[PDB]
Amino acid sequence: PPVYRLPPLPRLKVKKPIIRQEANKCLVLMSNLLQCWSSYGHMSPKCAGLVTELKSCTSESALGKRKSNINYHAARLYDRINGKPHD
Amino acid sequence: TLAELLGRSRIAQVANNHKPLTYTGKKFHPTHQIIETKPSTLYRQEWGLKSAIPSKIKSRYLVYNDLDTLERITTFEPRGGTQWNRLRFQEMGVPIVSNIGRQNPFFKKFNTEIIGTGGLSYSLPGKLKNSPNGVIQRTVVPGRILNLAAIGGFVADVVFFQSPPSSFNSMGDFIRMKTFLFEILEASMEKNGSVSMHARLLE
Amino acid sequence: EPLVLSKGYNIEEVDKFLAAIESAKRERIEKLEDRREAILRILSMRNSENKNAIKMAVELARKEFERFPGDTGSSEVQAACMTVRIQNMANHIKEHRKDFANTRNLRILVQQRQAILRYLKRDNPEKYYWTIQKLGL
Amino acid sequence: KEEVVKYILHGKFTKNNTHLTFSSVVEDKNLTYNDTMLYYLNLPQKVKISLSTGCLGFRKAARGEYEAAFQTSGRMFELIKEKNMLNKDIEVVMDDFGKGRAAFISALVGKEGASVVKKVVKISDATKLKFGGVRSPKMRRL
Amino acid sequence: DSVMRKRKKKMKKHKLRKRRKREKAERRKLSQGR
Amino acid sequence: KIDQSLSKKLPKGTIYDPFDFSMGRIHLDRKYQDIMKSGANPLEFYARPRILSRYVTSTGRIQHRDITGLSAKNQRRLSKAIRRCQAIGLM
Amino acid sequence: AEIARSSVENAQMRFNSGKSIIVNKNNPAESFKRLNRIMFENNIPGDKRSQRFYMKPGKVAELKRSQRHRKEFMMGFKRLIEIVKDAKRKGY
Amino acid sequence: MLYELIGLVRITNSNAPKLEAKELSSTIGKLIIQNRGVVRDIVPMGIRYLPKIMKKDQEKHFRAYHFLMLFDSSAAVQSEILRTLKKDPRVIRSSIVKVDLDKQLDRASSLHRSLGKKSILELVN
Amino acid sequence: KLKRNYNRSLLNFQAHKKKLNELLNLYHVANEFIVTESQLLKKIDKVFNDETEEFTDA
RNA sequence: AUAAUAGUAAAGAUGAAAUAAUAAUAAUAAUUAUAAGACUAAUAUAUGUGAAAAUAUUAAUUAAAUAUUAACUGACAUUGAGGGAUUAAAACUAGAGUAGCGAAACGGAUUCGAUACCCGUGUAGUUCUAGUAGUAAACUAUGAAUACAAUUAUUUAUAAUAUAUAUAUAAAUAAUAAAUGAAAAUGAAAGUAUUCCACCUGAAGAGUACGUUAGCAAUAAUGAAACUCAAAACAAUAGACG
Ligand SMILES: [Mg+2]
Ligand SMILES: [Mg+2]
Ligand SMILES: [Mg+2]
Ligand SMILES: [Mg+2]
Ligand SMILES: [Mg+2]
Ligand SMILES: [Mg+2]
Ligand SMILES: [Mg+2]
Ligand SMILES: [Mg+2]
Ligand SMILES: [Mg+2]
Ligand SMILES: [Mg+2]
Ligand SMILES: [Mg+2]
Ligand SMILES: [Mg+2]
Ligand SMILES: [Mg+2]
Ligand SMILES: [Mg+2]
Ligand SMILES: [Mg+2]
């Protein structure tokens, strides 16, 4: 395959390391409830427990629960990982 | 000379290959030479390679491709799972025989194809195995059903008298959790070097 | 000429070869004649490219000029080889006026020819004069 | 005869304005085989409701902007519902990637195009491009 | 030449062009018949 | 019951490993994934749209060498063949 | 006529371009998303946008070169970061 | 000089489609042979639908019959043949293209080469 | 000189042999090739009237 | 652009608006159907190819083109004043052509003003055929040739290897060592050397004037002096500023 060697750079770093967390439980419950209400009319008792669960989740605050060292490794290992020729 | 010593020596003994350490395709046999250390040598990071290996590695076994690369790191993976598969197979004690009517290759320009088995089993088929309870006719081995069954580091074809609904249909695609017993009938080996086992589900 | 062939073939030789093949087959008519005709058509100069004709002309020139059989690179034979190409190149230009790259190429070729005749004159004057006379210069 | 085979919903969504168009594919049931096949391939169309977002009272600049496009789409859907061109299947097509295109699709998805969606057999884009062709205007300095 | 230096040259060239434009009728008069 | 994306089906003749059952294995598999490559000039296939259409996007565009993964010369030959095809009726 | 009837819109399916998809009645939105993806792959909106104005041929060539460079840099960066990740994983 | 040909002929008649094609093949083959030429192979191809509704002068076409004629000729000849093809009303698209004989003498059609058979000897066997 | 002469002549001979082989191959082939009208007609009949081996891919 | 179909009040434009061969004479959008020019989406990297200008829809013709072998010639070479040929865009002279674009011009906006930037009509021009002319940031801002010098990674081609391996060659491209350099940086040349040609000798005045030659012309080449200054220029540094 076609390899692509970069030139000598000042500093290898990602400008925004994503630390892809899991989505919020409360938000999920809210979406589920919304989905249920799309069917079954406005407020039928099929989604009786779901609403209660949502309420329990969003009692103290609107969301329930409230970084990746990636550019601490790039910076560290750039000089090694280079194919930069000798001095 | 030095050259002769180098040719003899333990790094020259490891036959070179540039096969992927990460191969997500079908694995029918070992790709790379497994390399162990002693505990003492691990403690001072020495594996008998060009360089020291990172102190993050606490496993005694590994696999490698390059002693040193342009990236200034040895290309390795700290795992030696293939030895354990072989040892499991040995424990199971089901002797591999060619289902096709042919002589055993170990008895009697170059052929790169696999000579009989690849050396996972040098066992001969004619033996029985006695115990306190008696002479073992049926080899009992625990395995997991996937959907085929994973039986001691090998996937194996399975057969039964009646398909049990209580165990299967209760957890349709979480059958992997529950370990079931198996009766291994025989092990054949195809041209590609895959071990085609055949088991029977016991209840 | 009428029964001249491309691809370094000769019509007399081809017929003989065909006859030999026929004899071999017999050992081991109209249709055969038709096949022979088809072969001739395939290998004729007039169905083939101009390039083959040029090559043939160059070979002929070499044969004429070679001071011994292996002759290729004799200053005179080189000049002769150049001439055939020049003639063809000149003809091409006459068809195609504004083809300036190929006019340049022609120019270079005649400059090269001049240079090699100049050399020949220094080396071996009588031979050079003879060559010139042959080429019409 | 004049049998309506299917309807085609066309939406040209330029920078400054949208153009929504509904049209019936009118096949006649009633010569050479090749000619007949050609006729079958390209059935004549008749326009039923044309619409542009100025028709909904959006003047000058506001007609280039989504909300207006969405409203126009909703109006179109209402017209389709009322005027009774919902018996046969529908074919959606688009042009020119405006804001209004985004509006139209959203309207179709939602409750405003609820009755129409079930008849919509195929969506199929047909934006025009050029392989060289006429030179475009000089790129404005601003 | 930097761009700044070039700009003086450009200006000079423009002035020259202007002068030529101005002195077209005069130049014509001078040229014909002498 | 569960979807197909979150469970690696180990093949019949293959070996496996404890790791191989994991989520991480599946992720790794997801991460890591022809006649023109075989060694025959693509300019034989200019009367064979069926085969040339494989090296073309749904609309009709020719695919880039990054995508198709060819030798540069072989790619250019393929492209030529395609262009010849569309000059003719066929393709 | 009979022959035409027998040919039940066979050509109509293959004649049309790739900018066309059959909608599943359960999910029109999904179909629309798929279409959009297809359009993106074919670069049709970007082409349309490019074609609104004229750009001098040398200038567009320069732009194209710059884009290519940017592309090659990005995959060089990707390669580098993958190596960095591997090193991190191992211990280096 | 071996020139391959690809003509997409007209098919007006529904029941007997190949007749016009066959006539075309006859005529062009006759022309070739009259003018020092040698037709080697006349590979038929199917009644294949055109990609778009392709149109000749005051006509339209959606399906056609396709064929290759793999003949030898002079350059001049080939050009004349091409002109005659362009001219006639019963072909939609025509395309002559050279097959290079600098290396070989026996060369099969492009399709046969793509399949595997380089020379016509292979096809025969 | 002798060696050089041999080298010159051997290559030429080889080339000649190759040309002869090519000619022989052409001759072998040429029953399929067409010159006359009747042969052409026969070929046409074989191609079209049989309704067999139309080169179409699937 | 014209015409037909059905269809309804706006359409087109812009930062926002208007003017206009826009539209209640029935448009715009849509679907068809004719014609006309001019352009060439992807592939594409201008990779490559060409002396340089240049050069990517297809085909054919004629021309020229790579490498390695074999044989031959026997220094026939290098560079090249003068000279010669080709030389983008604009321009010009004829004769066709003229869709789109578009100097100018006119009109609408913008603005204190707006001989502009934006919008609308849109003539020269852009297109072809035959010429003239011989200039561009015609740039790699780097004349051509030969011998040589430390590494690595990429491709490309060549040979062997026992067709797919790891090897030997070249070639290019990218990082450098040394060396050179005012530094920026050059890196097989901006290094080490040899050969040949072109050209420079403060800034202004000036590539101006006069003269001559060439051109249908615009112009092109050639190319001074007086007068006036101790200036004028480049690389890099640190700020301030946007
Ligand atoms: Mg010379
Ligand atoms: Mg305009
Ligand atoms: Mg300077
Ligand atoms: Mg040069
Ligand atoms: Mg292109
Ligand atoms: Mg003119
Ligand atoms: Mg204007
Ligand atoms: Mg002009
Ligand atoms: Mg001239
Ligand atoms: Mg000038
Ligand atoms: Mg200069
Ligand atoms: Mg550099
Ligand atoms: Mg120096
Ligand atoms: Mg210097
Ligand atoms: Mg002057």
UniProtKB/Swiss-Prot annotation, chain C:
Record localization: Mitochondrion
Post-translational changes noted in the entry: The precursor is processed in two steps involving mitochondrial intermediate peptidase (MIP) and mitochondrial processing peptidase (MPP).
Role noted for this protein: Component of the mitochondrial ribosome (mitoribosome), a dedicated translation machinery responsible for the synthesis of mitochondrial genome-encoded proteins, including at least some of the essential transmembrane subunits of the mitochondrial respiratory chain. The mitoribosomes are attached to the mitochondrial inner membrane and translation products are cotranslationally integrated into the membrane.
Family according to the record: Belongs to the universal ribosomal protein uS15 family.
Other comments on record: Present with 6960 molecules/cell in log phase SD medium.
Subunit structure: Component of the mitochondrial small ribosomal subunit (mt-SSU). Mature yeast 74S mitochondrial ribosomes consist of a small (37S) and a large (54S) subunit. The 37S small subunit contains a 15S ribosomal RNA (15S mt-rRNA) and 34 different proteins. The 54S large subunit contains a 21S rRNA (21S mt-rRNA) and 46 different proteins.
Name of the featured protein: Small ribosomal subunit protein uS15m
Originating species: Saccharomyces cerevisiae (strain ATCC 204508 / S288c) (Baker's yeast)
GN (gene name): MRPS28
Residue window of the full protein shown: 85 to 236 of 286
UniProtKB/Swiss-Prot annotation, chain F:
Record bears the keyword Mitochondrion: yes
Major subcellular location class: mitochondrion
Any Gene Ontology CC annotation: mitochondrial inner membrane
Alphabetical keyword list: Mitochondrion, Ribonucleoprotein, Ribosomal protein, Transit peptide
GO molecular function terms listed in the Swiss-Prot or TrEMBL record: small ribosomal subunit rRNA binding; structural constituent of ribosome
Coiled-coil annotated spans: none
Cell compartment(s), UniProt: Mitochondrion
One BP term from GO: translation
Remaining remarks: Present with 1210 molecules/cell in log phase SD medium.
Record function comment: Component of the mitochondrial ribosome (mitoribosome), a dedicated translation machinery responsible for the synthesis of mitochondrial genome-encoded proteins, including at least some of the essential transmembrane subunits of the mitochondrial respiratory chain. The mitoribosomes are attached to the mitochondrial inner membrane and translation products are cotranslationally integrated into the membrane.
Family per similarity comment: Belongs to the bacterial ribosomal protein bS18 family.
Quaternary structure and interacting proteins, as annotated: Component of the mitochondrial small ribosomal subunit (mt-SSU). Mature yeast 74S mitochondrial ribosomes consist of a small (37S) and a large (54S) subunit. The 37S small subunit contains a 15S ribosomal RNA (15S mt-rRNA) and 34 different proteins. The 54S large subunit contains a 21S rRNA (21S mt-rRNA) and 46 different proteins.
Name this polypeptide is given: Small ribosomal subunit protein bS18m
First-to-last residue of the parent protein present: 40 to 138 of 138
UniProtKB/Swiss-Prot annotation, chain G:
Gene Ontology biological process: mitochondrial translation; mitochondrial translational initiation
Keywords carried by this UniProt record: Mitochondrion, Ribonucleoprotein, Ribosomal protein, Transit peptide
Effect of E30K: In MRP21-1; suppresses translation defects of mutations in the 5'-untranslated leaders of mitochondrial mRNAs
Principal location listed in the UniProt entry: mitochondrion
Keyword presence, Ribosomal protein: yes
Subcellular location: Mitochondrion
A GO-annotated cellular component: mitochondrial small ribosomal subunit
GO MF entries: structural constituent of ribosome
Reported function: Component of the mitochondrial ribosome (mitoribosome), a dedicated translation machinery responsible for the synthesis of mitochondrial genome-encoded proteins, including at least some of the essential transmembrane subunits of the mitochondrial respiratory chain. The mitoribosomes are attached to the mitochondrial inner membrane and translation products are cotranslationally integrated into the membrane.
Family: Belongs to the bacterial ribosomal protein bS21 family.
Assembly and binders: Component of the mitochondrial small ribosomal subunit (mt-SSU). Mature yeast 74S mitochondrial ribosomes consist of a small (37S) and a large (54S) subunit. The 37S small subunit contains a 15S ribosomal RNA (15S mt-rRNA) and 34 different proteins. The 54S large subunit contains a 21S rRNA (21S mt-rRNA) and 46 different proteins.
Any further remark recorded for this protein: Present with 1270 molecules/cell in log phase SD medium.
Protein name: Small ribosomal subunit protein bS21m
Gene (UniProt): MRP21
From Swiss-Prot, chain I:
Compartments where found: Mitochondrion
Signal peptide start-end: none
Coiled coil: none
Extra facts: Present with 2010 molecules/cell in log phase SD medium.
Family under the similarity heading: Belongs to the mitochondrion-specific ribosomal protein mS26 family.
Assembly behavior: Component of the mitochondrial small ribosomal subunit (mt-SSU). Mature yeast 74S mitochondrial ribosomes consist of a small (37S) and a large (54S) subunit. The 37S small subunit contains a 15S ribosomal RNA (15S mt-rRNA) and 34 different proteins. The 54S large subunit contains a 21S rRNA (21S mt-rRNA) and 46 different proteins.
Function description: Component of the mitochondrial ribosome (mitoribosome), a dedicated translation machinery responsible for the synthesis of mitochondrial genome-encoded proteins, including at least some of the essential transmembrane subunits of the mitochondrial respiratory chain. The mitoribosomes are attached to the mitochondrial inner membrane and translation products are cotranslationally integrated into the membrane.
Name assigned to this protein: Small ribosomal subunit protein mS26
Organism name: Saccharomyces cerevisiae (strain ATCC 204508 / S288c) (Baker's yeast)
The organism's taxonomic lineage, starting at the top: Eukaryota, Fungi, Dikarya, Ascomycota, Saccharomycotina
